[PDB]
Ligand binder design. Structure first.
Ligand SMILES: *[C@@H]1O[C@H](CO[C@@H]2O[C@@H](C)[C@@H](O)[C@@H](O)[C@@H]2O)[C@@H](O[C@@H]2O[C@H](CO)[C@@H](O[C@@H]3O[C@H](CO)[C@@H](O)[C@H](O)[C@@H]3O)[C@H](O)[C@H]2NC(C)=O)[C@H](O)[C@H]1NC(C)=O
Ligand SMILES: *[C@@H]1O[C@H](CO)[C@@H](O)[C@H](O)[C@H]1NC(C)=O
Length: 119
């Protein structure tokens, strides 16, 4: 999936600018499909759309996982010094991977814990 895989960037601030300029481009399609699935679950019948919403959430999560992982791997040492609040905040938001940092078994346990809690 081209949306799932980010591009090739450098470690400089201009590379970070290209990074943050492609992030919105991917976010357009992925967030659009996510909001469309949520709308279908909400504005229409709840049946035959819950699995659509679930798969949309899964693909959005994979998008964020890959893009944030690349963000961290490239700009962990230079995340602080950027001399511009906009891209600094963009990199700060993308860097935070949430629960994605956990290994496979730990992440599965965490998600199943959340599901059991809500249920
Ligand atoms: C909570 O979730 C479990 C599944 O477990 C999930 O993964 C774990 C690694 C933890 O992170 C959990 O928090 C996480 O939710 C639901 O599945 C239930 O699991 C049990 C244990 O495996 C199943 O077997 C039971 O085991 C013993 C005997 O071996 C007896 O208690 C029962 O007779 C039963 O066999 C159980 O069938 C299974 N239930 C399902 C699949 O419906 C669990 O329902 C859910 N809620 C609670 C209250 O635990
Ligand atoms: C960017 O770097 C990655 C590092 O694995 C490499 O695989 C990829 O081909 C590079 N992209 C381009 C367009 O050269």
């Amino acid at each position: 999936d081209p949306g799932l895989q980010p591009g090739n960037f450098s470690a400089d601030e201009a590379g970070a600018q290209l990074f943050a300029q492609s992030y919105n481009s991917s976010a357009e399609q992925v967030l659009f499909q996510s909001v469309a699935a949520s709308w279908a679950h909400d504005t229409n019948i709840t049946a035959e759309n819950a699995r659509r919403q679930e798969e949309a959430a899964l693909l959005s999560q994979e998008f964020a996982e890959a893009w944030g992982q690349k963000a961290k791997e490239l700009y962990e040492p230079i995340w602080q010094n950027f001399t511009d609040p906009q891209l600094r905040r963009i990199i700060g938001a993308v860097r935070t991977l949430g629960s994605a940092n956990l290994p496979l078994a730990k992440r599965q346990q965490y998600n199943a814990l959340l599901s059991n809690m809500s249920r």
